[PDB]
Symmetry: none
Subunit: 109 residues, 2 copies
Amino acid sequence: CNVEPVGRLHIFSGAHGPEKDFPLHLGKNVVGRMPDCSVALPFPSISKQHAEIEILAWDKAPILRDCGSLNGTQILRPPKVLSPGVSHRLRDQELILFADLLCQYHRLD
Amino acid sequence: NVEPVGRLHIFSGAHGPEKDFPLHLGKNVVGRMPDCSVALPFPSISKQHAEIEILAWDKAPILRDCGSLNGTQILRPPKVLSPGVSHRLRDQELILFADLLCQYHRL
């Protein structure tokens, strides 16, 4: 895990456990239930391959795609339910729901 | 200056600092006005945006939206809260007032 991060995915305290920060790197970051996933969230409502955060460069904005999850990926401000495979550019500090889990993307400095 | 039963945490980064507001027994008006129980001086927040009613220390707070322009969002389950409709707040529950993310805590 020596890959230099360019983003941060923050999970807020809930029922699933305490707050937590996940590093995001260049190229693709797979969000999923599986311990091997770049963002591993071992909660049964999260799909094995749930979503993909793709980051191409720094001055850019990441692309989030849902990978056909059972329980969906939503953005919140304004609300929208993401359709499987459709590229969505994340603004810094964007709020994201994977299933019931509320996450926030952060671009590093 | 009244004993709070609960607290609403406001998240920050680029939306204030991390501030806590006390919630007391009775009506807690969430809004833009400085005189609101929970005063959120942000232009997306209505003068009277939402209401948190605490009916006793042991009972789940009740959240309602006061016909706010930008809306109240709950996430248990994810939904715009219609004015008039009551929603029970659970400990640690995340909620959005217009664009402002908050978290409830029973003290």
